[model samples]
Target chain A: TSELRICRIDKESGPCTGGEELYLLCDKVQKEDISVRFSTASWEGRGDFSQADVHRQIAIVFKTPPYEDLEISEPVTVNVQLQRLTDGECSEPLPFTYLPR
Target chain B: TSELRICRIDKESGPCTGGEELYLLCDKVQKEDISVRFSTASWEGRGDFSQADVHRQIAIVFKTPPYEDLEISEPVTVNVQLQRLTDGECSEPLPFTYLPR
Candidate 1:
């Protein structure tokens, strides 16, 4: 059996019309013998998970392009859930955010 | 047109009192991107790119319900970047961090 770990969440916040990158690190009993899946949900959107399984320690990069015209007043909240598939046992929900970058 | 991608960068420290859940992964092209985005850097705060036209495979999330009034003693960094789209192009540098769980 392996345990699920939530590493860190880094965001590029400032004033440069473009996108930013984010990374999430996790550890397991067998880093090389486990599978990882990512799912996300917003205040207005349903939970959308990527159809892919990643092995130990994954870097989830997000692209936040220019926001010049729209009026973004509030900080957007994103619920990120990670499920580790090992021995038919999946870990709990590993949630975080993709703040306004 | 679609391009740009950076893979692998996870972070999850020890001793979790509360607030923990992180995940990230990319299965596409290879390469890294960077910019003055808000979810990826720090300073007097100049360039923070996270807006419209910022199209691409985007998935960003953040949260820290209660720091528990504790201090982080480990390491933390933010530099996660990735991109993938048709007709439009967007991508940037990938970073890491968040060692206070």
Candidate 2:
């Protein structure tokens, strides 16, 4: 049995009305199980980076609202799932995190 | 009536579980009418940078989840309101934006 682990996540800061870029770093218990799924809330919008491999650090970037609709209220939830595409086995969901300046 | 303008916003990058810092820059039509209010989604979490004034650049920083509970959904909205404390006048709410990588 293999498990997934969340290594790191981060975001940049600037003005409230402009756009920002976010990054995610993750790894797998077993190197062979390198497929991962990243998802945010409907309010946060949707992003695609599944093609990323866990062999090394993964970097994904997305545009702010207008480019994508995002509602800011409280802390948004981000869910990352690591899975083995070869056997279709998924690891526990790793919680996504963020900071606001 | 004076209006508020959003100058810039940015986020850094790192691991998903680690905390990242965010920054906001804004200006007011009238330098004296420079009080600003910043708010994020219930999930993106709440932050404070109100004391910042207009004439110069304002920097506001916040910690990601764990420090604050943030739900990573789609794009999260951030609202910024500029108000004149002396006269209690508030400009229209400026939409907050973000990018997910």
Candidate 3:
């Protein structure tokens, strides 16, 4: 499978509570198991896709991960990526701003 | 030592290049060895303070972690925290916005 590529995130950014839904556009297609997750360069900090519906053709609608209990105290920016649950091929990182509500 | 507590971060957020400096106010003080790092509930996603100076007692000036080379491709949010080098006591997570530049 080819690497992933994202055109853009609909809202681009939101509060860190993370229950909001966002629209994503991409080129690579994955099975119904297509997934999205938190992505960063650091080894210790990649957010996971606790919940998302990966649409195959060109777009996916997913909820942002929640930033709670772990006790995130402020707003910060992180990268998101498109991937597949089965194959695991991932696209380049995308921006998902988490703000303090 | 008590777990840590952050009073507030001056700017609150910025881009992810890791070079921008921000001012922080805290209740706990670090002995010269005060250190700062990322703080998120997610085990995989805490930004590190690759360059922060712990000004024990009240304030610290530190740079944001860089989001490059490791080949990150998008924008998202992360949680930051104040910790110690020798002891490792950490304050509540602080919000540090890492923008797309």
Candidate 4:
């Protein structure tokens, strides 16, 4: 595809300690060439899943990686993006809130 | 397809008041002929989503319908199954827990 895009995600926020599974909808993508990224200015992480977790090129089942600060007292919103490994292209980021546990 | 089956779901529990969105993976299914059913001994409800919500015939994005008793004080586990409308056939049921809000 010419451009990558995320259509929807089942949930926007989860516990900061992570290990939350998420269902994400997106435009057509190659399982071997794309990945889900979770990031902020100073820290970053990727959603935990294998290429096999990509379903029919349109959906992905993944677990959220733990936030940078597991002991945060408040929710922290971060950017989530679909990144293509081959071209280093990225879709517009979405906000994912990491809630205090 | 010869038979129906549910592969996995992103979540297994949500608040008892319902209206939660869930992501489900399943075997090849006809969007026009299948539905997600949530039931217990005395109550039954179907997940809310349109045909367009069925992704690549292997996944579905749907919202949980309100539980029969919105006032329940304890977590209640119910059976979730993929039901075919044309033949009234169903897959093996999975457990979904409804938590007290």
Chain A TM per prediction: 0.22, 0.26, 0.39, 0.53
Please provide, for model 3 over B40-72, each residue's C-alpha lDDT reduced to its tens digit, 9 standing for 90 to 100. Answer: 335233232322333322111212334333333
What iRMS does model 4 reach? Answer: 20.0
lDDT tens digits by residue: candidate 1, A3-81:
2333433442311212223223343323223222221221111111232322332244433223232333444322222
Residue ranges of candidate 2 with Cα displaced over 4 Å: A1-101, B12-20, B29-44, B50-55, B58-101
Q: Give the range of the ten consecutive residues with the poorest summed lDDT in model 4 chain B.
A: B57-66
Ordered list by lDDT, greatest first:
4, 3, 2, 1
Query: What tier of docking accuracy does candidate 3 attain?
Result: incorrect
TM-score (0 to 1) for chain B of model 3:
0.37
Task: Give the residue spans of candidate 4 off by over 4 A.
Answer: A9-11, A14-23, A57-101, B7-23, B41-50, B57-101
lDDT of 4 by residue, B1-101 (tens): 23445555556533333445665655555555655544333443445666677676222233343345557677655544333324433343334444555
lDDT of 2 by residue, A6-46 (tens): 43333423322332333333332332222222213322222
- Identify the superior model by TM-score, candidate 2 or candidate 4: 4
| Candidate 1 docking band | incorrect
Q: What docking tier does model 4 reach?
A: incorrect
* i-RMSD of all predictions: 19.5, 24.5, 23.0, 20.0
> After superposition on all CA atoms, how large is the RMSD of candidate 3?
23.5
- Order candidates by TM-score, high to low: 4, 3, 2, 1
Model 3: per-residue lDDT, tens digit, A1-101?
24344443434444433434444434443323333433233622222222233332211222234433324456566544333323443343434445554
Measured against the true structure, the TM-scores of the candidates, in listed sequence, are 0.20, 0.20, 0.25, 0.40
B1-101: candidate 1 lDDT, tens digit per residue: 13222232233221122122222343332223322222212211112222331222322332222221226465433333222223122123333333453
TM-score of 1: 0.20
